[PDB]
Design a protein around this ligand. Structure first.
Ligand SMILES: Cn1cc(-c2ccccc2)nc1CSc1nc2ccccn2n1
Ligand SMILES: [Mg+2]
Ligand SMILES: [Zn+2]
Length: 312
């Protein structure tokens, strides 16, 4: 059924653009992902049946949380697709498969709870994974689906390449732990300003992929303002529900997760743009000039938040 899906020709044009918003096309998301894999990686590299099977299983293991859900997975994969299409030749074919798959799978089985929560309230997952808690779990879920019957889309890879693609996927998913981003962007920016960055240097290459994963993960801020606004609602719906569980336990949450502090949201976004998103896309545009429209769109939404703060 996914196997016989064909993308409407109007989308074939729009999907290539960074600002493309998948939201209005829920029924088409699995088929959008196939399309993107076929365009980037070619039509002959995965068995169609397996890919579709794998996709429908990835969907099934995303939970119905307000933000970290199937819609989010596809949004992040789409941003990567546009990054890759615009920078096709800088990356190996193996990196394109892994990085599209990693993005689809990067928040697999998210409960609507942060790493801090699981750590603070000594959740089992935080016992198995001490840092990048959920992110290690997300990868562990990725491998588990790959290992299901008729799901191993990489089964025609040699052993060497299978373990290469898993490693690209592992690093990529871990990179989506925002705690790791700040150090990553700092190094990458220094490597850039000192003329020392080298894409054939593998550790550098891992870092650039890291920044890409971040840039994809945050990409709500690069959509048109009305889509940006509406996604923020999803983000805070999930944060506030976590802060609610903390209050039930007589723990005052951080303001970000306290629905009683929503007046502080516009300034909370403002800060996030200044400390996180603007710098991300700034360094990303430096390394990969064709990704500039992400920074442009990010800047436009920053100034919308600046407008909001002052009664506009
Ligand atoms: C950091 N922060 C802090 C606040 C805030 C909100 C209300 C009260 C006090 C602080 N909001 C934020 C924005 S959190 C965030 N995370 C993502 C991921 C993708 C796209 C947008 N955001 N915003
Ligand atoms: Mg995540
Ligand atoms: Zn994510």
């Amino acid at each position: 059924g996914l196997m016989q899906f064909t993308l409407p020709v109007r989308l074939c044009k729009e999907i290539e653009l960074f600002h493309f918003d998948i939201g209005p096309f829920e029924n088409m998301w699995p088929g959008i992902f196939v399309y993107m894999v076929h365009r980037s990686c070619g039509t002959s590299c995965f068995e169609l049946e397996k890919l579709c099977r794998f996709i429908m299983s990835v969907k099934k293991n995303y939970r119905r949380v307000p933000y970290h859900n199937w819609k989010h997975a596809v949004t992040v994969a789409h941003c990567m697709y546009a990054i890759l299409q615009n920078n096709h030749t800088l990356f190996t074919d193996l990196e394109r498969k892994g990085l599209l798959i990693a993005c689809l799978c990067h928040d697999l089985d998210h409960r609507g709870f942060s790493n801090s929560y699981l750590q603070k309230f000594d959740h089992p997952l935080a016992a198995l994974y001490s840092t990048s808690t959920m992110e290690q779990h997300h990868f562990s879920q990725t491998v588990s689906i790959l290992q299901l019957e008729g799901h191993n889309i990489f089964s025609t890879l040699s052993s060497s390449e299978y373990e290469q693609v898993l490693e690209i996927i592992r690093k990529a998913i871990i990179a989506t732990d925002l705690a790791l981003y700040f150090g990553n962007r700092k190094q990458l920016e220094e490597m850039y300003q000192t003329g020392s960055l080298n894409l054939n240097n593998q550790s550098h290459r891992d870092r650039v992929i890291g920044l890409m994963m971040t840039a994809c993960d945050l990409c709500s801020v690069t959509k048109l303002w009305p889509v940006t606004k509406l996604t923020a609602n999803d983000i805070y719906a999930e944060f506030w529900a976590e802060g609610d569980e903390m209050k039930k336990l007589g723990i005052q949450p951080i303001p970000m997760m306290d629905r009683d502090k929503k007046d502080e949201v516009p300034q909370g976004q403002l800060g996030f743009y200044n400390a996180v998103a603007i710098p991300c896309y700034t360094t990303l545009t430096q390394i990969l000039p064709p990704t500039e429209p992400l920074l442009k769109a990010c800047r436009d939404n920053l100034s919308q938040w600046e407008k909001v703060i002052r009664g506009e």
